[PDB]
Amino acid sequence: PVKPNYALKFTLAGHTKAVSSVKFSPNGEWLASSSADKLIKIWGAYDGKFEKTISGHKLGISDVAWSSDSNLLVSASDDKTLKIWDVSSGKCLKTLKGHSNYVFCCNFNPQSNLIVSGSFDESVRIWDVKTGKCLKTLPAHSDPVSAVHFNRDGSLIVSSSYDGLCRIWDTASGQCLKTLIDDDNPPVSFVKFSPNGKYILAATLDNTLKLWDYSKGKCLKTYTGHKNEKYCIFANFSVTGGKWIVSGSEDNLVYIWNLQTKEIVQKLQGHTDVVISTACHPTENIIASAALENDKTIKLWKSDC
Ligand SMILES: COc1cc(C(=O)N[C@@H]2CCc3ccc(-c4cn5c(n4)CCC5)cc32)ccc1C
Incomplete structure (x- = not known):
């Protein structure tokens, strides 16, 4: 496809420090997030609905x-x-x-x-x-x-x-x-x-x-x-629709490249700090992005292709 059309659908607030890493569950139902606030949070992958908080670490989490x-x-x-x-x-x-x-x-x-x-x-x-x-x-x-x-x-x-x-x-x-x-x-x-x-x-x-x-x-x-x-910064292969490369960026945007042509096809504007983590849904054209301490939120984006 010439370009995707990812658009912001949900913003997930709850973490009290920089988010570190977001990951979609392989079965597609969940988004897991980790943060410097020592907490793991589970969200509905399609409606961003907060499910639970998982706690136990004595210091911040970098990956999940x-x-x-x-x-x-x-x-x-x-x-x-x-x-x-x-x-x-x-x-x-x-x-x-x-x-x-x-x-x-x-x-x-x-x-x-x-x-x-x-x-x-x-x-x-x-x-x-x-x-x-x-x-x-x-x-x-x-x-x-x-x-x-x-x-x-x-x-x-x-x-x-x-x-x-x-x-x-x-x-x-x-x-x-x-x-x-x-x-x-x-x-x-x-x-x-x-x-x-x-x-x-x-x-x-x-x-x-x-x-x-x-x-x-x-x-x-x-x-x-x-x-x-x-x-x-995390980076991803997006394979559910067009074949993209997806990455965060220190200018607070999500970048999306055409894998073969290497051209930038879209930049997602919304976060207010470094986009440290991105993740691609296993079956739907959905991207999750997360940002550092000035933002502390997770954003879910959906494209038609
Ligand atoms: C490696 O050494 C350093 C790295 C950083 C750094 O990137 N801090 C950023 C801010 C907070 C944070 C949280 C998570 C991740 C993260 C985890 N993971 C990836 N990023 C990619 C895969 C797993 C990164 C960062 C800073 C200093 C050194 C010495």
Whole structure:
């Protein structure tokens, strides 16, 4: 389609500090949000209706992520722990202790039997969901880890760091398979596998997004026009309608690019602070965006294509 037409439908207020990370449940019914106010909040994905608040962390939360069956959440906190939550009961099932600094990023594998985490302690850890035990500690980087993500079959982990590196790890052995970006500058602020696991979306703190061919280790696409020099902003593949790249920006907008042509197709105006997190609904043309302390709200946008 030439361009989407995302429009603001709901604004979700409730957090009392900067929002950090929003994620749609895989079954499409929920939006989960995490914030520096130490709280997780669950919202109706289609009407933004507040459902519950999930509490337990002693310090702010930087990231949250859903299990495959939409029943569990994992959260990553400045209190140096991750917590596994049962969403329906709101109870903490396990506290994952081991990191010696802020836990900044987390994700389930598709099987939902493992959790990967990255921390300011410059390590990546792989946890067993059932027992809460740390299975592997990877000396992954030499600076804070900005993102960790499994691929579609769970056999690979991509990690990024302020040391300027992006590395790909073999889940079963923890050994490095490849260093995709091997520079000491700029800091690599976010990474994510494409849905099919063949490409890696990478953000760097020079206002640049890139699409990398994992197998070839080569950059295929470069996306520019937004502002990103200070913070680790989430970025997404939007696949429900047109094939877009979606990202927040430090000029308080949501940017949407055509994946193939690299042209900006839309910019969503409304937030009053850095749009730190964006997320794309699994089935509908819906985007969730969240902003830092001057805003503290979540916005839901819907497009016809
Ligand atoms: C990594 O080291 C730093 C990062 C920041 C930074 O980005 N702070 C921003 C403000 C608050 C906040 C909350 C969450 C996230 C976040 C989590 N996650 C991503 N962003 C992407 C994936 C998981 C970021 C930020 C600041 C300093 C260092 C040393």
